[PDB]
UniProtKB/Swiss-Prot annotation, chain A:
Function according to Swiss-Prot or TrEMBL: Downstream effector molecule involved in the transmission of signals from tyrosine kinase receptors and small GTPases to the actin cytoskeleton. Promotes formation of actin filaments. Part of the WAVE complex that regulates lamellipodia formation. The WAVE complex regulates actin filament reorganization via its interaction with the Arp2/3 complex. As component of the WAVE1 complex, required for BDNF-NTRK2 endocytic trafficking and signaling from early endosomes. Also involved in the regulation of mitochondrial dynamics.
PTM entry text: Phosphorylated on tyrosine residues by ABL1 and dephosphorylated by PTPN12.
SS bond partners: none
Name used for this protein in its record: Actin-binding protein WASF1
Assembly mode: Component of the WAVE1 complex composed of ABI2, CYFIP1 or CYFIP2, BRK1, NCKAP1 and WASF1/WAVE1. Within the complex, a heterodimer containing NCKAP1 and CYFIP1 interacts with a heterotrimer formed by WAVE1, ABI2 and BRK1. CYFIP2 binds to activated RAC1 which causes the complex to dissociate, releasing activated WASF1. The complex can also be activated by NCK1. Binds actin and the Arp2/3 complex. Interacts with BAIAP2. Interacts with SHANK3; the interaction mediates the association of SHANK3 with the WAVE1 complex. Interacts with ABI1 (via N-terminus).
Species annotation: Homo sapiens (Human)
Family membership: Belongs to the SCAR/WAVE family.
Gene: WASF1
UniProtKB/Swiss-Prot annotation, chain B:
Subcellular location: Cytoplasm; Cytoplasm, Perinuclear region; Cell projection, Lamellipodium; Cell projection, Ruffle
Family membership noted in the UniProt record: Belongs to the CYFIP family.
Role summary: Component of the CYFIP1-EIF4E-FMR1 complex which binds to the mRNA cap and mediates translational repression. In the CYFIP1-EIF4E-FMR1 complex this subunit is an adapter between EIF4E and FMR1. Promotes the translation repression activity of FMR1 in brain probably by mediating its association with EIF4E and mRNA. Regulates formation of membrane ruffles and lamellipodia. Plays a role in axon outgrowth. Binds to F-actin but not to RNA. Part of the WAVE complex that regulates actin filament reorganization via its interaction with the Arp2/3 complex.
GO cellular component: cytosol; extracellular exosome; extracellular region; focal adhesion; lamellipodium; neuron projection; perinuclear region of cytoplasm; postsynapse
One BP annotation, GO: cell morphogenesis
Organism annotation: Homo sapiens
Protein name: Cytoplasmic FMR1-interacting protein 1
Impact after mutating L640D: Constitutive induction of the formation of actin filaments
From Swiss-Prot, chain C:
Name used for this protein in its record: Protein BRICK1
One GO molecular-function entry: protein-containing complex binding
GO biological-process terms attached to the record: actin filament organization; cell motility; fibroblast proliferation; in utero embryonic development; positive regulation of Arp2/3 complex-mediated actin nucleation; positive regulation of fibroblast proliferation; positive regulation of lamellipodium assembly; positive regulation of protein-containing complex assembly
GO cellular component: cytoskeleton; cytosol; extracellular exosome; lamellipodium; SCAR complex
Lineage: Eukaryota, Metazoa, Chordata, Craniata, Vertebrata
Gene3D superfamilies reported for this sequence: 1.20.5.110
UniProtKB/Swiss-Prot annotation, chain E:
Function: Part of the WAVE complex that regulates lamellipodia formation. The WAVE complex regulates actin filament reorganization via its interaction with the Arp2/3 complex. Actin remodeling activity is regulated by RAC1. As component of the WAVE1 complex, required for BDNF-NTRK2 endocytic trafficking and signaling from early endosomes.
Stated family: Belongs to the HEM-1/HEM-2 family.
Localization per Swiss-Prot or TrEMBL: Cell membrane; Cell projection, Lamellipodium membrane
Recorded superkingdom: Eukaryota
Part of the full-length chain shown: 822 to 1121 of 1128
Subunit: Component of the WAVE1 complex composed of ABI2, CYFIP1 or CYFIP2, BRK1, NCKAP1 and WASF1/WAVE1. Within the complex, a heterodimer containing NCKAP1 and CYFIP1 interacts with a heterotrimer formed by WAVE1, ABI2 and BRK1. Component of the WAVE2 complex composed of ABI1, CYFIP1/SRA1, NCKAP1/NAP1 and WASF2/WAVE2. CYFIP2 binds to activated RAC1 which causes the complex to dissociate, releasing activated WASF1. The complex can also be activated by NCK1. Associates preferentially with the first SH3 domain of NCK. Interacts with NYAP1, NYAP2 and MYO16. Interacts with TMEM132D. (Microbial infection) Interacts with human cytomegalovirus protein UL135.
Full protein name: Nck-associated protein 1
The encoding gene: NCKAP1
Organism: Homo sapiens
Stretches that traverse the bilayer: 166-186
Amino acid sequence: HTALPRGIKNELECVTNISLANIIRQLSSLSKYAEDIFGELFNEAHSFSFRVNSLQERVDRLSVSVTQLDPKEEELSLQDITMRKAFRSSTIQDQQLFDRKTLPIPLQETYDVCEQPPPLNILTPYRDDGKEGLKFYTNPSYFFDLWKEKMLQDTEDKRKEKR
Amino acid sequence: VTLEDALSNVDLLEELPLGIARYIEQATVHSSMNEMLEEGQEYAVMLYTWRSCSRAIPQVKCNEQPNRVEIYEKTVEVLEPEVTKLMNFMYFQRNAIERFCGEVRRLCHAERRKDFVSEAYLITLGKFINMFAVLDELKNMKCSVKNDHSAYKRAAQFLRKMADPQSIQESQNLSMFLANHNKITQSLQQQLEVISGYEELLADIVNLCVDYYENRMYLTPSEKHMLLKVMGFGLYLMDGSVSNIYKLDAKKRINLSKIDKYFKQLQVVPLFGDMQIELARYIKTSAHYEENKSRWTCTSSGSSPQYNICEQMIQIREDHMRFISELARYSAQKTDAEYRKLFDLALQGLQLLSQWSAHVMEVYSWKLVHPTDKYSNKDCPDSAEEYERATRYNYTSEEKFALVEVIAMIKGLQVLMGRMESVFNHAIRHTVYAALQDFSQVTLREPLRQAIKKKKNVIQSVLQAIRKTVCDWETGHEPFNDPALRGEKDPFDIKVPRRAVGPSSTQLYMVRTMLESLIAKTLRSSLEGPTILDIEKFHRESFFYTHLINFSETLQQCCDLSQLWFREFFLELTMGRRIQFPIEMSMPWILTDHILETKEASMMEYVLYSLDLYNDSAHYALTRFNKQFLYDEIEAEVNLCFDQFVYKLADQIFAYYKVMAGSLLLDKRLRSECKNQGATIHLPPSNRYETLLKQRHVQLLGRSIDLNRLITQRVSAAMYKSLELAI
Amino acid sequence: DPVQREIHQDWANREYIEIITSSIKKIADFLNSFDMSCRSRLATLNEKLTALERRIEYIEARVTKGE
Amino acid sequence: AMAELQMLLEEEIPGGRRALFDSYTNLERVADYCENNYIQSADKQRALEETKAYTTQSLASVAYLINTLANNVLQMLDIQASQLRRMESSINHISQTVDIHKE
Amino acid sequence: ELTFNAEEYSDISEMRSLSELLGPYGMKFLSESLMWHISSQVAELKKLVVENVDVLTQMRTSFDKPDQMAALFKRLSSVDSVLKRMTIIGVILSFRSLAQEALRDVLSYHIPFLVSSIEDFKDHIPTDMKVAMNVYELSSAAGLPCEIDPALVVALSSSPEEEYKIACLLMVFVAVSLPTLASNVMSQYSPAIEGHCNNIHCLAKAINQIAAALFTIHKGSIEDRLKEFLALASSSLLKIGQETDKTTTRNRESVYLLLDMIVQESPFLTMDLLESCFPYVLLRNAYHAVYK
Ligand SMILES: [Cl-]
Ligand SMILES: [Cl-]
């Protein structure tokens, strides 16, 4: 790194005391990093606590409704097949998992300290094509736009080849 | 026993008689030079990541334009802070060349030429010339830079922006700088050739790289490639109007044959980012190449890949087996031997990883400079742009499968090594300490004994300077009752302590540097035979101590595959035609989609490793390039590609198990009867989706992805569609 | 003598430091592997809960009327 | 037990979590104290040995706070796992009962 | 000189058809006959254990000393027989599984209301063993897969501590014998089979159920005895990963896959435990080789 011992009094005691003070600061940093972890674990687990409770009470009163069921009186009507829609289970599909809004806070902070591209959008109002100046420098949506146009063209090329 | 050895023994008969503050100062200079290398690297990053601002600026079609002034005003507002970076760059390279050449002049003095220079500093000087090469090629490529400045210069003038004579001459110098091709390299030569004997220093630098490369004195791929790049640019600089590398070769001052062999075996290595360097170019463009063509064999390559990956894959897979089998077996106080073994494994593992990563990058590097065409690839369109011909169409199916194999074997071992860090760290520090203390306290007793006895005061001072610096005596005090200290022999035992801590950086640097001066009348002449071997031995083994002490950092550097995604160089070459390249030209997706498309069973458990390449590139864009837009684009690509990943994976997974079901229930007798009638109903090929289906938390771009949950969503929807169809 | 003494004390000082920093790293590693282990359990809990939610919605649909 | 879960969710985990944040602010204070106590110290060797004392104590503290909070989080997940176990059992009985009825 | 096609008598449709004809009574009688043949094989295995009781006892405690561990193995006899008999047991158990899975599907179709109660009753038990065998005997009669096979237990139940040691040593004997399979050309894993030509993939089922049965009879720790087995098996297989003999390592990678199968087949062993004593990267590469 730099130098060596010169045998002078209190030379060693001073540098190590600085080294130890830094270690204690690292433990201070470690205490905070642990929080961020246990925190994002608690948050999710705490959310499931809600759903669990909501479901439990939903299960409990259904367990009672079913008790009141009477086969002797239950009448069947054809209006269910005629006037009432059929049961549909949830069909939710998660997609676009890497939007900026899904970026975890820690990485977001590392991102903010990174260099931003030139403020080229300052010249946007002065363009004739009504386009954003920054898109001529960087355009993340370029990948999707090009892939989409490719799939449509490949859908046509493949469609007119059969004929 | 060689003939040379027998002759040396005979020569021994014919020869039978009938400061610390100094190193501290050198270490100061060395440390200072390194800081400038780091600074240059920052400028390299600025150039490589510099995209055209002018293209994003609305032009002035005619002098008669309403917003003419507004545009110009905004132009300066945007480009001014950027032009400042260019001024600083111009100033940096100017000062860097003076600094370097000033150091060359100092080491080339008639008297100093007879002096000793540490290997570490020659290397640093070597990295200096490479820095110049990198900066110059980056500057040569970036038309965007030159044009942006002109756009600023043209706007600042029309606006009559206040500027004093100094500011004007400053602007004028920048223009001339940005307009001159190979300016950095040309300035370097002028200031070098004015120094008498400069070619003698560069010869020392080159000879050292040749020695390291030949003897494997490097760990990471970048270290390996740096040696070659120094050899190349070195010879180039040594071949001018004042020096001649071929006459230098005749006097055996250098060995062009070895360098030629190295360049022939490895022809292309990364220079910076996706910008590669064809080593043989240094040779072909040298001042005296034309008259000495026959001297070289590396100048002939062709569009043919030199090595067969199939031969390479067999060995790699063998080494993967052999090493990991042993490592896995290593997962109260240990003995020195047991700690040494873990020490050896840590190094061997890092070396193995480096070889693999080097294989991948070197293949990729060669491909980039050798794009394919119709002649080599029938499916390669003649209109396809260079980058697509350099990547997408430049790999066969088997090549793409093999690359993912190596990538997976790399990342796989990296995980095992990482899990072993804590144990490694302890075993390494124990081993380095033991080796250092055993050498300084015991091994150096004999040499010191002879130096004192034969009044070799110069050697004695060095040996004592070493022992005084690092020795950690068990009694807290040196053994004053030592006979060797008086110069006499032993009738004597020393108890050497065992600590789990390595020496300080200064301690290790000083010891190695001083030992190096001994085995460098020379001091080496006054030393016995066996002792020189002992010193050479410790000096050789201690070369990797620093790497191992910083295991964590070294591990990452041996598994760096972050450059597969970056393509700013090729983007620049499109002259604004491309703001980016589509995903089909993107290596990470090329390698990943290939497995999804072919559904290759043998590769299905590897597919996540190729996808992990985005993490490497993302981390690199955030911590090294330090550019937001680069991450934005990586994230946007992952976002698109991962949706396709889930769709294709879930799709083939359902189809696979539907076919399995239909096959399991198909009447057996019917099968046999169809076979007997030449209409065999073919069985479904088995596959390997289980591991993918078990992934509950895929780490990608900071997110934790539950792949199982996503697949279930699609597969469930497929079940309902099947039922809906049947009914 | 004062230098030799300082060097022996430095070795001891640095070993102690190495011991602490080494422990700080084992804590950091636990935190990570603990984070991952809990991520798996949460996903498993989420998986089962979601299934139970769907199942309840299904059973309710069998015992109730439609729109 | 639901009581044990409420205790973990409302006090012990949030509490042991804040005790960790307190360690964050308290240790950076102890760090400055070790440097200030050394500056004002007439016995440098004495000041160092006391810093080492605070360092060792700081390590033992952080490891204890994490361990305590780790066990709490695990106990929480174990309880929630059994909740789903009992709920599935109840849902299955409801399902069987409905099947009997429809038949 | 076979006169029949096995697949036309033992495939899913066939075993289901068989279950239709035999029902719970018949299929239960079928399994009883199977377990008898297994008892016979276990009886012979014990002889091989007793015949090597000394060496095996040493190998069990000297598991971390390669040199001695290797020298001890050479003193073992009837290694092939141990592997051969355990494989037979695995095959028989594999058949029973096919029969039980077929029976299960058939019963869920004919007697859903009874099956519904049997499933709920087996899944949610606390627990005593003698009372668990009663819940398990009922369950298996309905084709439900059990962690402990009641029929197997009964079959193997026909000094108390002398017997326990044998069971323990049996696990050791098998664990240290696996590497031998690598020298057999037939130990080749086939993607078409999703198993090995010589049925050694059935060892996964044999090792698990025999352990669960024996260490239930002797009231030991199934989980601990299998943990020990895995460690000893992983250790033995890792050692051959550094050898070069084209013969002894011919099917090294195919034999490696057994460890994956053994863990998948066993509810007492987890992938995490396997990872800590045998990295999956080895298994990954192993699968790649056989699937390519
Ligand atoms: Cl197949
Ligand atoms: Cl059926």
